[PDB]
Short mmCIF file of C-alpha atoms and ligand atoms in Angstrom, two decimals:
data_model
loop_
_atom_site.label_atom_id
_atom_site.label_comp_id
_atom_site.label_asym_id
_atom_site.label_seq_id
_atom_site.Cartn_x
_atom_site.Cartn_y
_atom_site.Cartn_z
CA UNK A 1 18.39 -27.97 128.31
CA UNK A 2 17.94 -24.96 125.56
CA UNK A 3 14.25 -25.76 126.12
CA UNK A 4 13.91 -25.94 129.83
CA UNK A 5 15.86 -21.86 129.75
CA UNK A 6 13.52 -20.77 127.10
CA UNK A 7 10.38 -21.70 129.24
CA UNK A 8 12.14 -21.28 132.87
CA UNK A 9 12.66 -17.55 130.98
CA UNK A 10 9.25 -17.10 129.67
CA UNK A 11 7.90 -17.49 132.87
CA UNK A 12 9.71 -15.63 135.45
CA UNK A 13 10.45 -12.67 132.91
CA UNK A 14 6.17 -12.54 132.58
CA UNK A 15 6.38 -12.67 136.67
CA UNK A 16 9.00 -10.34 137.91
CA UNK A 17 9.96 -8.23 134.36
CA UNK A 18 13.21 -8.37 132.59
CA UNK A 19 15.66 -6.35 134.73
CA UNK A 20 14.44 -8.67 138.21
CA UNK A 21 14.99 -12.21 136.42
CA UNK A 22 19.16 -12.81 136.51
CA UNK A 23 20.42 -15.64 134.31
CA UNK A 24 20.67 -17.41 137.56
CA UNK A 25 17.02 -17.72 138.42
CA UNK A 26 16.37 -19.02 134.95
CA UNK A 27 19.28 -22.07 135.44
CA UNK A 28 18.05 -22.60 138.79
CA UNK A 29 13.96 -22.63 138.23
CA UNK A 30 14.92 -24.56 134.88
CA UNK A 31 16.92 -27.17 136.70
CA UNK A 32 19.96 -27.40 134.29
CA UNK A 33 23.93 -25.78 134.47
CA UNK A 34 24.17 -22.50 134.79
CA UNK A 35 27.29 -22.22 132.75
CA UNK A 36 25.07 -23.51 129.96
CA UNK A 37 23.30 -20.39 129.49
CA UNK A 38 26.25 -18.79 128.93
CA UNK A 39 27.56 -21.04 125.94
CA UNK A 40 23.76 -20.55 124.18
CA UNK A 41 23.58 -16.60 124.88
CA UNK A 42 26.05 -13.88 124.71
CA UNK A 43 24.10 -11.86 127.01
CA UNK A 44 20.80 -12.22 128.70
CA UNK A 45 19.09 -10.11 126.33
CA UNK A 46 19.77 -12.26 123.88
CA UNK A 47 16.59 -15.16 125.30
CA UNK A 48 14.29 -12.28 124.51
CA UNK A 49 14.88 -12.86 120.47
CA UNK A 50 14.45 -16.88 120.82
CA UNK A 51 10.97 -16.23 122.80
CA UNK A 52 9.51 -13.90 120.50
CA UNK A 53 10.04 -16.29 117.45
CA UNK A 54 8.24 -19.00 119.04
CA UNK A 55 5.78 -16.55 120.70
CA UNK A 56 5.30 -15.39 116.96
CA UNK A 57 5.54 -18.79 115.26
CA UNK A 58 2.65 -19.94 117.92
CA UNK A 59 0.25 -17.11 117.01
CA UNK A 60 0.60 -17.51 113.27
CA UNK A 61 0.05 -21.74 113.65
CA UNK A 62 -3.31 -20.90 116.31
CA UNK A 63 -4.64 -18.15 113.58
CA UNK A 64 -3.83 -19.99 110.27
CA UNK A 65 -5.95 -23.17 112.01
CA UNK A 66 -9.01 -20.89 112.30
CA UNK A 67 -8.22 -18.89 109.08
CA UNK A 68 -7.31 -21.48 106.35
CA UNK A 69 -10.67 -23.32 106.40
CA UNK A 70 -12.57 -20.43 105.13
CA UNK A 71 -14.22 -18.54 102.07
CA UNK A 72 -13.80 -14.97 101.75
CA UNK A 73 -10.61 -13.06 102.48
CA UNK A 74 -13.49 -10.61 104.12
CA UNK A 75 -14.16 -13.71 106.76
CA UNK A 76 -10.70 -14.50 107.35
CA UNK A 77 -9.96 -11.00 108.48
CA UNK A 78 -13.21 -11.13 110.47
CA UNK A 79 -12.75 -14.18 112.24
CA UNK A 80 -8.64 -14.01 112.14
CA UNK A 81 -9.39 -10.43 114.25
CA UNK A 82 -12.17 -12.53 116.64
CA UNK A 83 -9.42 -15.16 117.47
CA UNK A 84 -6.62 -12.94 117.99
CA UNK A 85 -8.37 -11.25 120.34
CA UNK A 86 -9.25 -14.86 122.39
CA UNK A 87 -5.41 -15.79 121.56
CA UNK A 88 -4.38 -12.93 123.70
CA UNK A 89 -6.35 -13.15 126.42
CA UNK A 90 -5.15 -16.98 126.79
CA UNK A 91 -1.78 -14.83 126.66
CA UNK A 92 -2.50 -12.07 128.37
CA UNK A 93 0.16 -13.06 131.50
CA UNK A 94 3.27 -13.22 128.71
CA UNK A 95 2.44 -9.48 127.04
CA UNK A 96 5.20 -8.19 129.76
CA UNK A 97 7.82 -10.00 127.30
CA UNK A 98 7.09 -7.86 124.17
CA UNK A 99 6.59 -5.01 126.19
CA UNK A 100 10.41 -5.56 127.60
CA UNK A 101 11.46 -6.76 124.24
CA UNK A 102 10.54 -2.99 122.61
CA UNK A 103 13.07 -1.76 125.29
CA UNK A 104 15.86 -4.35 125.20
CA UNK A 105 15.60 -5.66 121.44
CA UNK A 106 14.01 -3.36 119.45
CA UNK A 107 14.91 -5.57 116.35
CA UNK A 108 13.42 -8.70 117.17
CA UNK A 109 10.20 -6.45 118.48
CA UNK A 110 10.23 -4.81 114.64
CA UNK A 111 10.87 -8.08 113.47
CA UNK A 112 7.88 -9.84 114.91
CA UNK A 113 5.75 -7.21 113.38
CA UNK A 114 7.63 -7.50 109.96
CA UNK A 115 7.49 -11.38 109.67
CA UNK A 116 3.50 -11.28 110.78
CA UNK A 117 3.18 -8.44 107.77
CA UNK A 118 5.20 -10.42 105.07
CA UNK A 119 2.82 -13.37 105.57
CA UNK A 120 -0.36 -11.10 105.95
CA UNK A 121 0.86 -9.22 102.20
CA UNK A 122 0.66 -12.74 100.14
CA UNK A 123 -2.77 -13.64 101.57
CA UNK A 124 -4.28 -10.14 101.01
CA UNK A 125 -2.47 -9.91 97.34
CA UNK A 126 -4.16 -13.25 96.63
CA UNK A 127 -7.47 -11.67 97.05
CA UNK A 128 -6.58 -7.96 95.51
CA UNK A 129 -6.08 -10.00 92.44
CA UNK A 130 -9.36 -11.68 92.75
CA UNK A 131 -11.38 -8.79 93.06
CA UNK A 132 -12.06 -9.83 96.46
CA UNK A 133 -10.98 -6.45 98.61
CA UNK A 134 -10.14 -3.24 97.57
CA UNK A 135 -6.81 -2.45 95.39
CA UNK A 136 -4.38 -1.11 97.58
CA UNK A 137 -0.91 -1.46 98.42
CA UNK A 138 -1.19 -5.16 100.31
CA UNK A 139 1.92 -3.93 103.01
CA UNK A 140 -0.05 -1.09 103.89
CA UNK A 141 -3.25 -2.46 104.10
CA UNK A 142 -1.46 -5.53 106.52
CA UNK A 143 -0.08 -2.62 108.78
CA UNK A 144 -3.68 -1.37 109.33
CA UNK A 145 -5.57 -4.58 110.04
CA UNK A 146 -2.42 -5.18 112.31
CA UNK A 147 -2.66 -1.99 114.38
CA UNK A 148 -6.35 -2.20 114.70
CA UNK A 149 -5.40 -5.60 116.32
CA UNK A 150 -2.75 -4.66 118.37
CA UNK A 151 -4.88 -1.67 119.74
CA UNK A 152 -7.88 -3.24 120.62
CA UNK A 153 -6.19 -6.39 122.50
CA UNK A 154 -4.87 -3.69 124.30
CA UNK A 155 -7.67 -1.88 125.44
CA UNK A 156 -10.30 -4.80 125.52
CA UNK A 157 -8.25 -7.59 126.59
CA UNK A 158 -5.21 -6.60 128.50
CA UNK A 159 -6.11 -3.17 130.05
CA UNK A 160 -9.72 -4.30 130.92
CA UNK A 161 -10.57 -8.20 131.03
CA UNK A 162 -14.36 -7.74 129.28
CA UNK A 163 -13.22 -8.38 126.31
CA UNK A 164 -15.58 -7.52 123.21
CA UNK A 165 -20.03 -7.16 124.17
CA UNK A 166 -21.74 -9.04 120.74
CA UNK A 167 -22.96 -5.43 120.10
CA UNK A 168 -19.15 -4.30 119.92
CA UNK A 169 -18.66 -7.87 118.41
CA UNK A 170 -20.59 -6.76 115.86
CA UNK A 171 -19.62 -3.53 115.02
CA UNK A 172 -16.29 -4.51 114.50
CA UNK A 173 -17.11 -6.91 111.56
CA UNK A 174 -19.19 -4.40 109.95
CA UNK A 175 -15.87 -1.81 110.57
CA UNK A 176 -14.00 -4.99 108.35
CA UNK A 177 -16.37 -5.18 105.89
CA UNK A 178 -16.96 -1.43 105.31
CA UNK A 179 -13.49 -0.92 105.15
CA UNK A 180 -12.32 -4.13 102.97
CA UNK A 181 -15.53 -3.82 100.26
CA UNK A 182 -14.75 -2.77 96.73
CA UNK A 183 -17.80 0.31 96.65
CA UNK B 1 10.59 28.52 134.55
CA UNK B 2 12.64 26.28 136.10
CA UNK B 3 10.27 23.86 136.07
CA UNK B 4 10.28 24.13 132.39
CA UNK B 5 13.94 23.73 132.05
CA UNK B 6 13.73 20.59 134.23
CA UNK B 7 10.83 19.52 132.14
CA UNK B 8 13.32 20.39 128.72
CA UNK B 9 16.23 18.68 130.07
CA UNK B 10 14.70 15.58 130.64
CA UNK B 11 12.72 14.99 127.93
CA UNK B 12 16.44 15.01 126.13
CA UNK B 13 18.08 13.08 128.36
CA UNK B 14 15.49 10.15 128.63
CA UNK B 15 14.98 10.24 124.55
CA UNK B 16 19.41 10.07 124.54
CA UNK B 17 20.40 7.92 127.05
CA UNK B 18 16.70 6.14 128.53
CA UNK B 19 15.24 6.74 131.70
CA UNK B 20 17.07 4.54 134.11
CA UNK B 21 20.95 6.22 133.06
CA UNK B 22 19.20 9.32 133.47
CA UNK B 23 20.04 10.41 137.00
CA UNK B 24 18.52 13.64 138.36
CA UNK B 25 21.95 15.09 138.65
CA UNK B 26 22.13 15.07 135.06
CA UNK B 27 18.54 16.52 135.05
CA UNK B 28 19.14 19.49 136.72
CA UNK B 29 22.74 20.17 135.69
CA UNK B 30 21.16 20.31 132.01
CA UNK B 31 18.75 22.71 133.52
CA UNK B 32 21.18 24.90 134.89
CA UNK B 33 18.72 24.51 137.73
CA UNK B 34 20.05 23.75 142.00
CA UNK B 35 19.73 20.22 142.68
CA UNK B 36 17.18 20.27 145.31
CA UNK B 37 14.63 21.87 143.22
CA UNK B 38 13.95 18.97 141.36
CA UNK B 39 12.78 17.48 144.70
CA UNK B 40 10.10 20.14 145.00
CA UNK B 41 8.55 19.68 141.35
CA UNK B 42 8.67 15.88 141.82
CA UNK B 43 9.00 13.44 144.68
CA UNK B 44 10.72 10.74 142.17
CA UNK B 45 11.83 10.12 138.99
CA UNK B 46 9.06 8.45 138.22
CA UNK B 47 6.74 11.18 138.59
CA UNK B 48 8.86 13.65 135.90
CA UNK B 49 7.31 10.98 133.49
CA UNK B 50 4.31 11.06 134.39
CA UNK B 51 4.32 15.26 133.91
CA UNK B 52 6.39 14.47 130.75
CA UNK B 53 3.75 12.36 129.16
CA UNK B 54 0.94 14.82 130.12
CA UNK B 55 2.38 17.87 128.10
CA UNK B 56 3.13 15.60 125.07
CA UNK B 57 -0.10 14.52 125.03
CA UNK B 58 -1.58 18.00 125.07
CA UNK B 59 0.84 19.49 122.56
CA UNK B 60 0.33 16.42 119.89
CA UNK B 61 -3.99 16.83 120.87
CA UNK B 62 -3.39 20.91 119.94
CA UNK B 63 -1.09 20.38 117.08
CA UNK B 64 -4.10 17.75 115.17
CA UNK B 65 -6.70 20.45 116.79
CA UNK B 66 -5.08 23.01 114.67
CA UNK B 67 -5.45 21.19 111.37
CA UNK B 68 -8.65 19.39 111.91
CA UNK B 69 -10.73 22.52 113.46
CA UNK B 70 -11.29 23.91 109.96
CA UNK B 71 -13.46 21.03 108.69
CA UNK B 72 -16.93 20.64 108.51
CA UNK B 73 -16.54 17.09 107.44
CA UNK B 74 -15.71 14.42 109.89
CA UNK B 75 -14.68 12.39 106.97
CA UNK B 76 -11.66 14.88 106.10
CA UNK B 77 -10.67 15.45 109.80
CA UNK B 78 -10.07 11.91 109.75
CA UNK B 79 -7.80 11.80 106.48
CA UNK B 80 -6.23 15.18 107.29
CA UNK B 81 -5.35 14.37 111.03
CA UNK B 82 -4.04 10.67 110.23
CA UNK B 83 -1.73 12.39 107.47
CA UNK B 84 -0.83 15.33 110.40
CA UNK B 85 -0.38 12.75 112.82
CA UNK B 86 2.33 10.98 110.78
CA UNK B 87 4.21 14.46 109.99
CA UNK B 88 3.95 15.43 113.76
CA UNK B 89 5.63 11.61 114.83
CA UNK B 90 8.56 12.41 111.95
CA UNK B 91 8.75 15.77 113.91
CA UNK B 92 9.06 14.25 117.44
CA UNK B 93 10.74 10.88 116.29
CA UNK B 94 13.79 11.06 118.43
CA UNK B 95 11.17 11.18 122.00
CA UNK B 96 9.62 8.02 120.97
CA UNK B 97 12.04 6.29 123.34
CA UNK B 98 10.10 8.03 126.27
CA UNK B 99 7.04 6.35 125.10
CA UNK B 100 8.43 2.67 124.81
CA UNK B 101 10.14 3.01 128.72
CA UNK B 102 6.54 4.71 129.82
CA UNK B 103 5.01 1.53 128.95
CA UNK B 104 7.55 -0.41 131.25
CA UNK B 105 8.36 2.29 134.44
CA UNK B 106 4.86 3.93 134.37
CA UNK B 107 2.48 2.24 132.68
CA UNK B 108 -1.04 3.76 134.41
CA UNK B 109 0.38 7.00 132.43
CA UNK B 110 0.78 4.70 129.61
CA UNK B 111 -2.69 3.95 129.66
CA UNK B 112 -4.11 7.10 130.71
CA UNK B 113 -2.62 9.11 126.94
CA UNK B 114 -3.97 6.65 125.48
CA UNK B 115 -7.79 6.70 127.28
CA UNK B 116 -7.75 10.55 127.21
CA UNK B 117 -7.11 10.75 123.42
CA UNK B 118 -9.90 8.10 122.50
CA UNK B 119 -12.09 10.44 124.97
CA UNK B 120 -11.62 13.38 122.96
CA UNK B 121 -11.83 10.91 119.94
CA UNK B 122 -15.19 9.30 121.10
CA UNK B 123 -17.32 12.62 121.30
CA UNK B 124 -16.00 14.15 117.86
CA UNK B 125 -17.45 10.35 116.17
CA UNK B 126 -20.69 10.07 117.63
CA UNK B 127 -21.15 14.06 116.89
CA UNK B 128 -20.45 12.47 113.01
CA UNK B 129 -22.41 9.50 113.58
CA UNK B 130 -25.69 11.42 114.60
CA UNK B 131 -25.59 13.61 111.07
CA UNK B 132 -25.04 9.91 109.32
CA UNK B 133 -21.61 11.48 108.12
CA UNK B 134 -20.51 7.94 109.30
CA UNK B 135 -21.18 4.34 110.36
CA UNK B 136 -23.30 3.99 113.45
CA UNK B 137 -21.30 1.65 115.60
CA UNK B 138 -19.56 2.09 119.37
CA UNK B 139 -17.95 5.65 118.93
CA UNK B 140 -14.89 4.61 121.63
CA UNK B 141 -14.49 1.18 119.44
CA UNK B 142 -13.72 2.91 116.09
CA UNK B 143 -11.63 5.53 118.23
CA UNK B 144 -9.58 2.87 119.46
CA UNK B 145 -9.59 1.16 116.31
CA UNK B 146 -8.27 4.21 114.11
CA UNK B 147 -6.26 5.35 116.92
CA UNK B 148 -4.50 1.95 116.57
CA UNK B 149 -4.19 2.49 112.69
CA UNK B 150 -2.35 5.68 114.01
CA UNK B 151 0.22 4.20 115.95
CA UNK B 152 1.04 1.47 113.93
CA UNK B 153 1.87 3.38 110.69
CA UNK B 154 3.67 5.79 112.76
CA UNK B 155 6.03 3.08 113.86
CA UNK B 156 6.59 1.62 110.38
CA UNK B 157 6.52 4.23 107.89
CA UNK B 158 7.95 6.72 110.69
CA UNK B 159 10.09 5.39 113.59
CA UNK B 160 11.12 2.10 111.92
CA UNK B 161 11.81 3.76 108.49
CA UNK B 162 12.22 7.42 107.63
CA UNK B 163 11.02 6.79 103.97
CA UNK B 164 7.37 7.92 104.87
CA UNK B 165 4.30 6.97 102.72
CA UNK B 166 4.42 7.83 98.95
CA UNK B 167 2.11 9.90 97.71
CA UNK B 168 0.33 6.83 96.04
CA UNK B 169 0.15 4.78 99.77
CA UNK B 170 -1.14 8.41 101.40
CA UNK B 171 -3.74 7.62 99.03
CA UNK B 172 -4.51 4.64 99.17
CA UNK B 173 -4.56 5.37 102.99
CA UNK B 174 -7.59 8.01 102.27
CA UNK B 175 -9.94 5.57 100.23
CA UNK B 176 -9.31 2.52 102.88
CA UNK B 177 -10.54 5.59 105.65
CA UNK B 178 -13.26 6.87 103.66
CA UNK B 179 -14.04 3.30 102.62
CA UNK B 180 -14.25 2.22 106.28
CA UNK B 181 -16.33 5.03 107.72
CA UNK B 182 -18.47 5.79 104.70
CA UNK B 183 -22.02 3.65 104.86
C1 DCC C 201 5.16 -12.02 123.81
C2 DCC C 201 3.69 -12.38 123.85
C3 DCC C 201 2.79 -11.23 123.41
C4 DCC C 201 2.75 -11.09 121.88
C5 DCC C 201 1.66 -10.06 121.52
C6 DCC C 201 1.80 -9.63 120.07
C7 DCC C 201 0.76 -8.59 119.63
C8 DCC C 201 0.37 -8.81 118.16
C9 DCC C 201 -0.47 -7.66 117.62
C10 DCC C 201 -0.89 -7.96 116.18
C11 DCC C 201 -2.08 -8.90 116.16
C12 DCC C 201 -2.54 -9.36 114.82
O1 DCC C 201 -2.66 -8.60 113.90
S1 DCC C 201 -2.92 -10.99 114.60
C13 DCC C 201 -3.80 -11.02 113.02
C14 DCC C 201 -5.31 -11.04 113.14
N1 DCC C 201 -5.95 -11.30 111.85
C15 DCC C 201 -5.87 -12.44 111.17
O2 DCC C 201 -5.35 -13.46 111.62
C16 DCC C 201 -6.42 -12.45 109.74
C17 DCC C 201 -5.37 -12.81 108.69
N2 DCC C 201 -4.83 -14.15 108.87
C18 DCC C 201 -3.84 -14.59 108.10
O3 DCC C 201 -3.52 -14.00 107.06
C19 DCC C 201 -3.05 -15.77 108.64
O4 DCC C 201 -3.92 -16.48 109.52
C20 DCC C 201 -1.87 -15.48 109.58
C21 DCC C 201 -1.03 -14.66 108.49
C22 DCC C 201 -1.89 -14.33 110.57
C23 DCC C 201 -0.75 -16.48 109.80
O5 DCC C 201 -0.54 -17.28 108.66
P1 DCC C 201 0.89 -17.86 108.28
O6 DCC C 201 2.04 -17.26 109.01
O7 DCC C 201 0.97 -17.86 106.78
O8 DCC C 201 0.76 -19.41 108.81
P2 DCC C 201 1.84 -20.55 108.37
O9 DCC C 201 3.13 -19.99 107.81
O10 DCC C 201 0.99 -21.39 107.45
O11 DCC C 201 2.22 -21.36 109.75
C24 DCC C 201 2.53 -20.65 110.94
C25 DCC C 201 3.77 -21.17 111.66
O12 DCC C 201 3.38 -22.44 112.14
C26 DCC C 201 4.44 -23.38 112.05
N3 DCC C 201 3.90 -24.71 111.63
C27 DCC C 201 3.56 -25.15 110.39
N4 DCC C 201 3.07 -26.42 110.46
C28 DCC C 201 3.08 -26.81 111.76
C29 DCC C 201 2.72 -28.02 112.56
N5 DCC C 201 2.22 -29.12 111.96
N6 DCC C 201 2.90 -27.99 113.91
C30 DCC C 201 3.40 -26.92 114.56
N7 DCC C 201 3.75 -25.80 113.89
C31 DCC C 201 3.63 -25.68 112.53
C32 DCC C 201 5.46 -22.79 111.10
O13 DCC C 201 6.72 -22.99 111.74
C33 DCC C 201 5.07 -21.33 110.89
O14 DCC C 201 6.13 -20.45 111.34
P3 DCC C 201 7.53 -20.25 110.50
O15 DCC C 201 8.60 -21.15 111.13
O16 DCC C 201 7.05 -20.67 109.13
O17 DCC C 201 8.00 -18.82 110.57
C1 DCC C 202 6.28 10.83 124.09
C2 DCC C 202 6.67 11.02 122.63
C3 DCC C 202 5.75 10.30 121.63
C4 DCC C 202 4.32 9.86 122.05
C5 DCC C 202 3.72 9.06 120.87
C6 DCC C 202 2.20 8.96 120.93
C7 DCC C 202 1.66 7.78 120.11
C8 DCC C 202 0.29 8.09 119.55
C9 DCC C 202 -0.34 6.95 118.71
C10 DCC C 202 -1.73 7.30 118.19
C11 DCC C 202 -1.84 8.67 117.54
C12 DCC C 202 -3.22 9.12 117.06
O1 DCC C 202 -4.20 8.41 116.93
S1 DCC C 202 -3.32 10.73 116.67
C13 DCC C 202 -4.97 10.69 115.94
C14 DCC C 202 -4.93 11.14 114.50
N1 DCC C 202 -6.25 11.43 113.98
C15 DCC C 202 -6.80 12.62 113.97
O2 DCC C 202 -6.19 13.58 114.35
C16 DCC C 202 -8.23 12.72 113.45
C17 DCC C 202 -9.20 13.11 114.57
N2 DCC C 202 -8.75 14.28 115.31
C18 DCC C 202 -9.46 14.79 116.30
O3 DCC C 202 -10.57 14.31 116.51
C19 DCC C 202 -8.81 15.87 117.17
O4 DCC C 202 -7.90 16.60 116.32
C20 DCC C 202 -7.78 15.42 118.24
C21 DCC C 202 -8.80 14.61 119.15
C22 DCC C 202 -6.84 14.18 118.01
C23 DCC C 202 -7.42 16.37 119.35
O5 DCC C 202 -8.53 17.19 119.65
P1 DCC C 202 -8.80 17.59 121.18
O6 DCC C 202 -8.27 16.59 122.15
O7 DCC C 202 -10.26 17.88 121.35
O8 DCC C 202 -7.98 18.96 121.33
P2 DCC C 202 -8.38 20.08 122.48
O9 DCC C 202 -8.77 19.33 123.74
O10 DCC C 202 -9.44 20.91 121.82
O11 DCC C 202 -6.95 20.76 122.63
C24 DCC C 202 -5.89 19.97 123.06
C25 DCC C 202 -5.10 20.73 124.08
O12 DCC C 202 -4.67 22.01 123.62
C26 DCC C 202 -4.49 22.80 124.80
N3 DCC C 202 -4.21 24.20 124.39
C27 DCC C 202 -2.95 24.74 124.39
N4 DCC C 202 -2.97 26.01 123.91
C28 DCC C 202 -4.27 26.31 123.60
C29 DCC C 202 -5.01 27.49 123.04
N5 DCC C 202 -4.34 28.63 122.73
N6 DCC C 202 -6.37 27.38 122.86
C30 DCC C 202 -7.05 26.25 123.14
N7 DCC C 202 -6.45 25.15 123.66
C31 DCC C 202 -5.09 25.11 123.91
C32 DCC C 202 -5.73 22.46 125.61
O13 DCC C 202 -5.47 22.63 127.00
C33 DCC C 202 -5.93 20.99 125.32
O14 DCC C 202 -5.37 20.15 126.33
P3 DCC C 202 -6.23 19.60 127.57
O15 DCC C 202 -7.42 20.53 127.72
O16 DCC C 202 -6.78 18.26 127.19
O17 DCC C 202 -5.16 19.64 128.61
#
């Protein structure tokens, strides 16, 4: 029943926004109590943290399939980037929820960013160490790969639905490279 | 004049309270301005952040301006505005709020600070890109890409701490820039 008011949630919040969807259009569409809702959140804006993990869980378990099979730290960043950007677009409907979430939860927004960063550190450490890419603090260097990410699903994927040309394609690996290359 | 104290008042009392407590009573009381005025300047609410996105947009493009106008080198514009653009965000900090409810209540205005800046962007990198200063790729791709650098450091190092980057990570920050745009 937990699982039914997570995805009854997901999906109307994506639809109508945050402030339209009341808790009892998610017990309704979900088919269980509404009561229930209730006893598993305080408030309403308390779904919005539950969603986000999975949301974030999901997008780490679809990247890490594409990125743990391969060589260079230089290609996982280059294909990792690639596949984000085709992860996105599957989820380009749900990007209302993290919009809402920066208004409503803040914390869990900051969070999602934080977790994704603490995982992205270790890997780029690992290849610091071999000589790989280019010695720099590893938190930093997450935070810009990151925000290139963010940016460009933005602008190629959820403000325009052409995603990348192979020209832009690309020019964005050789951006990756550039940047990541020990001179 | 009055529309200036309209335009002052509300920028504090969306940043305080957010835009949907912010009723135009409060607005114009702020203001010291009659109540019906605000009704000339702006059929809705709405609209006040639209005009209050505009002059933010403007003000941050003329505060980089300032400090990047004095270089030759396309290079050092790009360290030297990256570092500005953090010290302007630490500056402004407490508006950020008006950004993040933007996104939900008006979010072609959203868009559009985002498009004009990579517009002004685009035509100072292929300028750059012609001399072979830097890497010949899509000018409004690498816009958007160190655009998104931009905005993501801002929120961690600025909004979601108010440490700031050491002097080692500011940097580290001007090798992984030089290093990215440098062929
Ligand atoms: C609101 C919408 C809009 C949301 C829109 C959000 C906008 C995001 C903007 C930023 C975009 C990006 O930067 S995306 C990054 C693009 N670049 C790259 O991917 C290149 C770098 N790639 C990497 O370093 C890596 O691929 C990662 C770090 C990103 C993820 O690796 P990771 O996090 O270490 O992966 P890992 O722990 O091994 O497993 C992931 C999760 O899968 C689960 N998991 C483990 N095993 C299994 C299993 N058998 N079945 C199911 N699930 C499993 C775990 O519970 C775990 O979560 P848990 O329970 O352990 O916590
Ligand atoms: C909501 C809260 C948070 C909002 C939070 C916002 C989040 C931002 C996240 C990303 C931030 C970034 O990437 S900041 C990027 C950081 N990087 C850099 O700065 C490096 C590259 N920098 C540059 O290339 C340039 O410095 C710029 C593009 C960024 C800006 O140059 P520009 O856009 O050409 O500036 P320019 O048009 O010449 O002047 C800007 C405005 O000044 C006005 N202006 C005013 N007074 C004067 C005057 N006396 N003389 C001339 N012009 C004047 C003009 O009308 C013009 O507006 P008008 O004619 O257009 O009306």
């Amino acid at each position: 029943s937990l699982n039914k008011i997570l995805d009854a949630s997901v999906e109307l919040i994506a639809d109508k926004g945050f402030l339209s969807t009341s808790i009892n259009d998610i017990t309704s569409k979900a088919g269980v109590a509404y009561g229930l809702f209730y006893f598993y959140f305080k408030s309403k804006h308390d779904i919005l943290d539950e969603i986000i993990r999975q949301f974030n869980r999901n997008m780490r378990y679809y990247l890490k399939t594409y990125t743990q099979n391969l060589d260079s730290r230089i290609d996982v960043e280059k294909v990792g980037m690639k596949k984000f950007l085709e992860w996105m677009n599957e989820n380009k409907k749900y990007y209302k929820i993290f919009i809402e979430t920066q208004v409503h939860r803040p914390d869990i927004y900051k969070w999602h960013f934080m977790k994704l960063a603490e995982r992205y550190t270790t890997g780029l450490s690992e290849a610091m160490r071999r000589g790989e890419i280019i010695n720099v603090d590893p938190e930093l260097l997450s935070y810009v790969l990151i925000g290139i990410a963010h940016m460009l699903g933005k602008r190629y994927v959820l403000w325009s639905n052409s995603g990348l040309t192979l020209k832009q394609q690309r020019d964005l690996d050789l951006i990756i490279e550039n940047m990541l290359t020990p001179r």
